[PDB]
Each structure stands twice: as C-alpha cells, then as structure tokens.
Amino acid sequence: CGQRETPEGAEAKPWYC
C-alpha cells in the first residue's frame, strides 16, 4: 500500500494501509 501506514521511520512499507 501507500496511502496511510507507510511512515518514514519504518524505512519500509509494512503490508497494508
């Protein structure tokens, strides 16, 4: 995903938003 739950501090996309 790329809508909400992709914070910079994660340095990665987790899974879903």
11: left (phi over 0), alpha (psi -120 to 50) or beta: left
Question: What is the three-class DSSP state of 6?
Answer: coil
CB 4 within 8 A of CB 14: no
**Vertex 17, ends 8 and 13: CA angle to 5°?**
40
Question: What is the three-class DSSP state of 15?
Answer: coil
